[model samples]
Target: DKSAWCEAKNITQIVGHSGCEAKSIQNRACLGQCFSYSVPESLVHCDSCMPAQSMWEIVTLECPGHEEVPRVDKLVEKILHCSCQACGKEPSHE
Candidate 1:
């Protein structure tokens, strides 16, 4: 059986708006499997991989030359740490 664990992994994210898009490389994201179980007369217990720590970052997107805008800056969440938490529960930020 696979062991239950949570961790942050590197990923590439695309930020876009108004026909402009940019790639944010090497971003961290939560990924992993968590414990799950069910009983005959009780709610199924489960956990989800989620972000524990994060920060806001800026991503610049370049618009088409013919368009009114040349570049745009957007904010995105950058995950720093991950953990397993109860499903449907609000994520806690550190």
Candidate 2:
């Protein structure tokens, strides 16, 4: 079935910045299509696949042979879980 089923899938992401070399890192991402429909006399209802749980991780980037810029540590979001929720609604924590 081609229904809306959210999941966290493993993916390789390239992290980079201007003037710094990039790095390929493994991470989890929220994936899958969402459901949406419309009805008479009612507004359109929609759900989106989004991250349910996540954490921040630091990624290091190296600037080759540059004296002024040596290395950079960038904070990136790492997804841990995924779920279907109201479209554009913020994820709530309890």
Candidate 3:
């Protein structure tokens, strides 16, 4: 398994039920931009990012705080609503 220290980093979360909000890639939409951990971090993406259907993809992030399983629904709600940059879409303008 890939392991790395944890720290706060920019991330993109997949919200809704398997992009439940809508269909198509755009509709899939990015939950928004926020901090997240990828791997080996104290608080990792095991649960906070991965779910039965929903998945929060961390674009560029590290880890920090917490050293076990935890959810980030509140942080998810906090990130600015945005489109998937990897999909060539502009972020939502607040």
Q: What TM-score, over all chains together, does every model reach?
A: 0.69, 0.73, 0.17
Query: Which stretches of model 1 miss by more than 4 angstroms?
Result: 16-21, 41-43, 64-68, 91-94
- Best candidate, lDDT: 2
Across residues 1-94, which tens digit of lDDT does each residue of candidate 2 receive?
9777998899999999888999998888777788888899378888988888777889989977578778888997888788887788765312
Give the per-residue lDDT digits (tens) of candidate 3, residues 1-94: 3432222234544443321231122222333333344666665542121111233332222223334522222123233333222322223332
| Candidate topping TM-score | 2
Which of 1 and 3 is ahead in lDDT? 1
Q: Rate the local accuracy (lDDT) of all candidates.
A: 0.80, 0.82, 0.30
The number of clashing residue pairs in each candidate reads 0, 0, 5
Q: Write the per-residue lDDT of candidate 1 for residues 1-94, one digit (tens) a residue.
A: 6889997998887777876765655578888899989999488998999988887778888877546678888888888889898888756456
What is the overall TM-score of model 2 with all chains considered together? 0.73
TM-score, prediction 3: 0.17
Scanning candidate 3 in windows of ten residues, the lowest lDDT window is 18-27
